[PDB]
């Protein structure tokens, strides 16, 4: 009750310093105003072509302008999943004591925890009509995705759903930060050497999580057990994602993690 107190703070700053897009900024672009040049709406194949085209900035002379689209969208998300994975790695090594764990172990904690964490925050930028893409610049409509030729139309629908209820809980960045730290720091990951320091460590996060959640949303007494359940709805959402995504490694196999993720991958960080 001293160092375990500034522990919650230190984890909120880690978040308010490693995530380019949080819920407040995110909530103002969506519901917002004070800017009359809102996100660019991607509501169909034509607009999705402009979007994805300028995005890879090697596609207004080259040729990537009309292949099945269902598989074009499966590209941006990657030119958006290196950014995403690194901020969660910095934010994590900014988590008190996390930098301790033997590196080899720090890879294990972020490897199985990465996806749960993403979808958790992914909820900050979503709303019942569509999510925000590209740092708040564009806004892809929910409908447009569930219309793509199967089995695509069912990749983003499970997440949107989970997020509509998760956003009902009404957390904020101070909450989300702890929540997200607690999913990284979970000692039930396969191959952990010091499978005990991670728990000791984790007890703090979840302990502050409970206390912060009592004096932050004092009227959802069962909000904490609620969130302990979500930490579960998410380990199983990723699980199903992993599946649905593999009808795309075997079948589609044109745009995979070919050894082309490297042209920017090395000399960059």
């Amino acid at each position: 009750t001293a160092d375990l107190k500034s522990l919650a703070k230190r984890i909120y700053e880690a978040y308010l310093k490693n995530f380019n897009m949080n819920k407040v900024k995110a909530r103002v672009i969506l519901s917002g105003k004070a800017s009359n040049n809102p996100p660019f709406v991607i509501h169909d194949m034509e607009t999705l072509c402009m979007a994805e085209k300028t995005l890879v900035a090697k596609l207004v002379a080259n040729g990537i302008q009309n292949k099945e689209a269902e598989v074009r969208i499966f590209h941006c998300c990657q030119c958006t999943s290196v950014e995403t994975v690194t901020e969660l790695t910095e934010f994590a090594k900014a988590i008190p004591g996390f930098a301790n764990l033997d590196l080899n172990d720090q890879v294990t904690l972020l490897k199985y925890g990465v996806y749960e964490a993403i979808f958790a925050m992914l909820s900050s930028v979503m709303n019942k009509d569509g999510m925000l893409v590209a740092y708040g610049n564009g806004f892809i409509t929910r409908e447009f995705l569930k219309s793509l030729r199967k089995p695509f139309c069912d990749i983003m629908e499970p997440k949107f759903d989970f997020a509509m209820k998760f956003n009902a809980l009404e957390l904020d960045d101070s909450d989300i930060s702890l929540f997200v730290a607690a999913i990284i720091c979970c000692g039930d990951r396969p191959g952990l050497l010091n499978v005990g320091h991670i728990e000791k460590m984790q007890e703090g996060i979840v302990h502050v999580l409970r206390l912060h959640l009592q004096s932050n949303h004092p009227d959802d007494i069962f909000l904490f057990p609620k969130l302990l359940q979500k930490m579960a709805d998410l380990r199983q959402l990723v699980t199903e994602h992993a599946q649905l995504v593999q009808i795309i490694k075997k079948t589609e196999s044109d745009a995979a993690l070919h050894p082309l993720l490297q042209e920017i991958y090395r000399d960059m960080y």
């Binding site: 910095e90 490897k111 993720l261 960080y269």
Partner: peptide, 19 residues
């Protein structure tokens, strides 16, 4: 998940900055 520790192990070493 799956193994992308590639990208994650490189963001592990290559920064500098801290309050």
């Amino acid at each position: 998940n799956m193994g992308l520790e590639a990208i994650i192990r490189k963001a592990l070493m290559g920064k500098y900055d801290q309050w």
